[PDB]
Design a protein around this nucleic acid. Structure first.
Ligand SMILES: [Mg+2]
Ligand SMILES: [Mg+2]
Ligand SMILES: [Mg+2]
Ligand SMILES: [Mg+2]
Ligand SMILES: [Mg+2]
Ligand SMILES: [Mg+2]
Length: 190
RNA sequence: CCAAUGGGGCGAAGCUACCAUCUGUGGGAUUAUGACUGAACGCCUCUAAGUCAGAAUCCCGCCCAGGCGGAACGAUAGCGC
């Protein structure tokens, strides 16, 4: 079955300016700008109102798979609003039974060195995605804080570190060592 | 000198032996898999749209040949313009 119309709307905070170049969404906020291209989805984007702006997503004559893309766009656009206003802050804890995991931040938070992971002599060097900054946590021991405006870049950056410290040829239910994503917050709490 | 290389010792050059010696190499997309964001299904979800890492595999490189396939350049005798 094709549905005549399926739509959803997004509310834009006053401090965020959204402009459309076709299906390219440009969100400008206090923390910067994010541009995402949605040309791989056949939807219709509309900006409504002037005082309280809104973004509308329309899908005319959509089957089940095409209808599922309508909310996906809204959620991405909301994350972009969240990124440019509050930012994204993933925290990671390093877990170890015997060998402390030493983390050194280089290149202004764009490179992470991991040493002595399960006692390995090999040094792991993880490169953060552009626009993502890693830093050791002054508040807690054995913790990292990744910050950025793009949720996917920040969360991909953290996945790289988490998968860098993988245990091999052991029972990973026993050998639990590794750095893991422990919290998903925002840079500015508001 | 002859004995169809008379026999035997040592033996140049050449050839030749893991029986001596030397040299044997880099990327790309990715598989399995593990994940990101994320609906579908207000939650969840590696998947649906989008995204990441990924290998004796695969393709290429390096290497071997070099097409009824080209190229630049030289010189061109009764011959070119
Ligand atoms: Mg064992
Ligand atoms: Mg005789
Ligand atoms: Mg001899
Ligand atoms: Mg590769
Ligand atoms: Mg996959
Ligand atoms: Mg890849």
């Amino acid at each position: 079955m094709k549905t005549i119309l399926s739509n959803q709307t997004v509310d834009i905070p006053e401090n965020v300016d959204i402009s459309l170049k076709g299906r390219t969404v440009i969100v400008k906020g206090p923390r910067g700008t994010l541009r995402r291209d949605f040309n791989h989805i056949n939807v219709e984007l509309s900006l409504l109102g002037k005082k309280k702006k809104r973004l509308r997503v329309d899908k005319w004559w959509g089957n089940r798979k095409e209808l599922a893309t309508v909310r996906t766009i809204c959620s991405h656009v909301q994350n972009m609003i969240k990124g440019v206003t509050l930012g994204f802050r993933y925290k990671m804890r390093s877990v170890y039974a015997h060998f402390p995991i030493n983390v050194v931040i280089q290149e202004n938070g764009s490179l992470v060195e991991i040493r002595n992971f399960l006692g390995e002599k090999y040094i792991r060097r993880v490169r953060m995605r552009p626009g993502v900054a890693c830093s050791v946590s002054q508040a807690q021991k054995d913790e990292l804080v990744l910050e950025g405006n793009d949720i996917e870049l920040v969360s991909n950056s953290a996945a790289l570190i988490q998968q860098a410290t993988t245990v091999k040829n052991k029972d990973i239910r026993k050998f639990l060592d590794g750095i893991y994503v422990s919290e998903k917050g925002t840079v500015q709490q508001a």
